[PDB]
Design a binder for this molecule. Sequence first.
Ligand SMILES: O=c1cc(O)n([C@@H]2O[C@H](COP(=O)(O)O)[C@@H](O)[C@H]2O)c(=O)[nH]1
Ligand SMILES: O=c1cc(O)n([C@@H]2O[C@H](COP(=O)(O)O)[C@@H](O)[C@H]2O)c(=O)[nH]1
Lengths: 218, 226
Amino acid sequence: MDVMNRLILAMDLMNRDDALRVTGEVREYIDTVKIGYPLVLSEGMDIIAEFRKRFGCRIIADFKVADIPETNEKICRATFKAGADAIIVHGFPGADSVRACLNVAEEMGREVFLLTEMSHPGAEMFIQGAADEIARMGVDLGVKNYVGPSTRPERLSRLREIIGQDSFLISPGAGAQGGDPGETLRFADAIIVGASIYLADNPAAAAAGIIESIKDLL
Amino acid sequence: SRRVDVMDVMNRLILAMDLMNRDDALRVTGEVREYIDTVKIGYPLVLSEGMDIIAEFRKRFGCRIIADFKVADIPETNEKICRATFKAGADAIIVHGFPGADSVRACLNVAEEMGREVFLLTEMSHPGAEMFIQGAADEIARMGVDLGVKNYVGPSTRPERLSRLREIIGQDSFLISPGAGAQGGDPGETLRFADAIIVGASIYLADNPAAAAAGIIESIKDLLNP
Ligand SMILES: O=c1cc(O)n([C@@H]2O[C@H](COP(=O)(O)O)[C@@H](O)[C@H]2O)c(=O)[nH]1
Ligand SMILES: O=c1cc(O)n([C@@H]2O[C@H](COP(=O)(O)O)[C@@H](O)[C@H]2O)c(=O)[nH]1
């Protein structure tokens, strides 16, 4: 997919008015919005349909789907019915769980993003040791879209090595968590940015500033 | 209950209510209410009908509600998810252990503040669980013990693993177990180790869900009470 300015907004405000207002402020800079459970649990799945309709943007549902295959299927169907273009799925529950999501996405013309390694310190306990194998499992499953950590560019490089140059890689952890936009974009196709933008005094200025800092990579 | 300090679950049977429309979900839950007082509500129903389905279940049935949200994000996002869930009236939430201790601790802190419970999911019931989760499961359980977790989830499909998990978490912990029924787990064998079983489709897709629940209860009657 073609993400404008290589920048995806993580819209984790939990109030519909604040979420709509802030997203509107940065819409000229960003055409791809990640909506997760903080906003969806607070305002309902209809918020995905509303965002796509109002903003004419791509919506990635960040649901970190992590259940058994049959439940994963139900979650994916509900999510795509609401109009999401893509869904983020954990790889650690294994290949049948991921395949269930891939099957629903194929049926409905949507994409699965496989989360391979996470950005937070706790990721080092169990996920990091499995991450290379999760990525390889994704390759064998036919996964073309992946998520890996801005906070560990050496791990992004390794992930890129496994998934190849044609796969799409997006990366959270830039800004608030300490990752650097420019360094992350050496390996990832796009960065995900949340609080650095949505908690800024001027979200538009924050977005513009991030974009200026990576201007030569656009 | 098996101990005075653990969650009392009527008939050791928790309904996994994964129907995806309000009318069917309310009907089936109402039909089985004389057998079951504890309902696990997950994303299939919540995404379809909204978090206010929790409010409706509390109103109509007064059942204990476990929000099966398999929380599996970074600590900051986990906190937001737990806050929204308990704000909506859930009694407890289920959290993955695979993302590590800081992510689990975030959920425990919210539960502590809000006077609710966290269940730690240690090993899963489906075959895919063997690829990565099973190899980490003993360590995930020990992590739970180190963090002071009292409530755990482990697989009905593998009682030999439940035996081991019960060893790690001890007799003073509360353990519930999905995979009984549809996925092939046996209720009686599972209840050797688990305090309660979770059952979904073999009840909610039955021609007569009440009859299905009653049949499960009859099959485990020697294990019921207290
Ligand atoms: O490994 C990961 C995977 C994520 O989806 N995320 C998500 O990316 C976003 C990061 O937001 P922020 O820029 O405010 O740190 C959050 O929505 C978070 O849940 C993450 O931080 N790390
Ligand atoms: O390891 C696990 C953990 C679960 O929460 N579950 C959940 O338990 C329920 C099982 O339902 P069923 O009896 O229809 O197989 C589903 O809601 C599923 O998401 C599971 O099956 N295995």
